């Protein structure tokens, strides 16, 4: 198991580590990977910003920091790597994230979510939308496992 | 490794089963835990959905479904797992996910990216939220890691 | 200028207020619009939620509440009213909302932001991506208006 | 009325457009503010920002274009403007556009919706919420209009 995780990292933030301290965890090894990004202009040039990214990972083990000029997904193939890392931009999932709080001290504790980014048909089907069109008597045959729409709807 | 899967299901849906498919690649098992959620009022008895997602997924060699009535953290702890997957109802990350998909079939292909949310007091940290409080003459030392502080500011 | 904001207010919250005080600056008349949503099998009754959140609005002067069963675009037709509010469950724009509030206290003050979803299309369209593919010269005439699209790209 | 829509414009691109076609419905006047952003090092000068956006822009008769160096809220002042345009890079409410399309051409039709991003504390607040801390007894005096509180909560 090997993860990417790939940035810019102009500078180093507390986000950044938190994300390399939390992805760390669930590969053999994870690979930081900084880019050029010449088109962004960086503050700080590309050793610069490797070596600070080094300097402040050198405490996880299991992390090796690497510049790039680019083509990430060539980069993922000399890794035999089919995974990569990134911190989302936005806070959602509210109530979700309020409950695994409360567990996180005084349950069970320390556990991870991992997100998963719905495909684009897919953004558009939820439960409770299928469950609209059942009540339309609308058809949900392309929205659910074949396995199950028999048992979900007919004529 | 185990990781939980957790929802209410009422029913399955096709983004249920993508999310499944992506998230057992990443296991040596998945357990998809369905909630009872009495509070919902779901739409299919708790026995129905159990049973609409294990046909489903019985193509899933690794996944295992199994009801439950809450206490996520407690199952959870039940498993030995400390990890969680969950489908993101939003899509962000555009730019991105624009050049993976290019990737995904011309390039190296088959890519998955795994979506970190940040914590409370992260979200508010950015390399350029950074690069701004810097060029301002700011205080950025509560935003970056100890080890570079003195590399990007000082007096 | 009438606007709506509807919802089942299952019960109404203090997001819900802030909501409904933020948007009624906005329209001569705000008609906040009290769902029935019998599929969402409320709490409390729809006569309950309409009156509470009746108690809880009489202080802003041009919010008129009324319940309504279902069909919201013919509401918004018998209201001649062609703009509804919603509240969004996700928070992004982090560096723009950080700099408004510095603003909104020791600069201007009090500034309100109307964000507009953008669609489906234009999702997968920015500036940056516009300029990734005029680097790569690429095609973007799609993405682009037509009266700049021959100062940016040729041949 | 006066609203603001700033932006680099770096360039201008059809999203862009859309929003201020869309957000020009709703003032006397827009004032569409081109940001100076050196800091971005954009690619096209400020000069061609502003005449291309004006050259895209002339169609719409209440829209100005007017490029500005930095002080967004002091711009903001100086137009006696307290309300602001921006566009979510992010889509959401998936169910909700879902109905407002199908309205958008053979229900109501051409309904816009304007989006309210929430404070700090009310993002962790909705009735779902409430509704499970009033299951479980406990306290929701701090989420909750006052008037409402002893109508759902005792003792």
Same mark, same amino acid.
């Given at each position: &198991?090997? /993860?990417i995780?790939? /940035?810019?990292?102009?500078?180093?933030?507390?986000?950044?580590?938190? @994300?390399?301290?939390?992805?760390? $965890?669930?590969? $053999?090894?994870? @690979?930081?990977?900084? #880019?050029?990004?010449?088109? &962004?202009?960086?503050?700080?040039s590309?050793? $610069?910003?490797?070596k600070?990214?080094?300097?402040?990972? +050198? =405490?996880?083990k299991?992390?090796?920091?690497?510049?790039?000029?680019?083509?990430l997904?060539?980069?993922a193939?000399?890794?035999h790597?089919?995974?990569?890392?990134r911190?989302?931009?936005?806070?959602?999932?509210?109530?979700?994230?309020?409950?695994? /709080?409360?567990?996180?001290?005084?349950?069970?504790?320390?556990?991870?979510?991992?997100?998963?980014?719905?495909?684009?048909?897919?953004?558009?089907?939820?439960? =409770?939308?299928?469950?609209?069109?059942?009540?339309?008597?609308?058809? #949900?045959?392309?929205?659910?496992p +074949?396995?199950?729409?028999?048992? @979900?709807?007919?004529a």
């Open positions: &198991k090997v /993860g995780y790939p /940035g810019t990292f102009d500078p180093v933030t507390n986000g950044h580590i938190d @994300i390399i301290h939390r992805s760390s $965890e669930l590969f $053999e090894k994870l @690979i930081v990977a900084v #880019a050029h990004s010449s088109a &962004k202009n960086p503050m700080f590309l050793d $610069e910003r490797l600070m990214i080094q300097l402040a990972t +050198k =405490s996880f299991n992390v090796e920091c690497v510049a790039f000029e680019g083509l997904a060539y980069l193939k000399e890794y790597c089919k995974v990569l890392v911190g989302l931009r936005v806070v959602s999932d509210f109530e979700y994230e309020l409950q695994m /709080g409360y567990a996180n001290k005084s349950l069970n504790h320390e556990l991870e979510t991992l997100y998963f980014m719905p495909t684009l048909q897919n953004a558009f089907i939820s439960s =409770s939308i299928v469950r609209s069109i059942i009540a339309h008597k609308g058809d #949900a045959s392309h929205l659910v +074949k396995e199950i729409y028999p048992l @979900i709807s007919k």
